[PDB]
Amino acid sequence: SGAIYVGNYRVVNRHLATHNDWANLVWEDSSRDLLVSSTTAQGCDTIARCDCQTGVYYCSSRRKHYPVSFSKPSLIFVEASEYYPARYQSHLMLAVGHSEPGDCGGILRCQHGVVGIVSTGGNGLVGFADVRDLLWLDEE
Numbered sequence: 001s002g003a004i005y006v007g008n009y010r011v012v013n014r015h016l017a018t019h020n021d022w023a024n025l026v027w028e029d030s031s032r033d034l035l036v037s038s039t040t041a042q043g044c045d046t047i048a049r050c051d052c053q054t055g056v057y058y059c060s061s062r063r064k065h066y067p068v069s070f071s072k073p074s075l076i077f078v079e080a081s082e083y084y085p086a087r088y089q090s091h092l093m094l095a096v097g098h099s100e101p102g103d104c105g106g107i108l109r110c111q112h113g114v115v116g117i118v119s120t121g122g123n124g125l126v127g128f129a130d131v132r133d134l135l136w137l138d139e140e
């Protein structure tokens with residue numbers, strides 16, 4: 001589990017969105033595993049606007065933050081899970097790092113701010129849904 005709180009937005013994995021998220025929906029995209037809902041309180045996270053390929057992510061199954069090198073956002077085939085059939089996911093970045101299904105939502109960050117959230121993984125890989133192209137998260 002986990003979310004990014006930026007401005008009056010909450011960014012979560014689409015597959016973990018709550019009824020309150022759907023009833024306060026701003027934007028969602030199944031092909032990216034992302035959903036954004038509105039919030040009453042202002043958040044403290046800032047979004048990175050950069051091309052970093054190194055950062056640090058939070059892994060709940062280890063209660064630890066790990067440094068990682070990650071690929072550029074791409075279209076990658078993701079295996080079937082309890083939440084999606086096997087399909088192509090867009091804007092996904094892969095890295096070598098531990099992950100388990102419930103690690104989705106952990107933040108990946110660089111020196112510039114939040115880069116994305118854990119979305120996929122297995123066998124010593126972890127995949128992150130990028131958010132750096134969503135420029136509208138920084139305004140209104």
Ligand SMILES: COc1ccccc1CC(=O)N1CC[C@@H](NC(N)=O)C1
Pocket residue numbers: 015032033078081082083084089099100101102103104118119120121122123
């Ligand atoms: C972090 O995911 C894993 C880690 C280790 C093993 C297996 C997984 C995959 C998994 O169970 N998934 C459930 C949510 C689905 N998200 C998506 N964007 O398709 C991925």
Ligand SMILES: [Zn+2]
Pocket residue numbers: 048049050051052110111112113
């Ligand atoms: Zn950066």
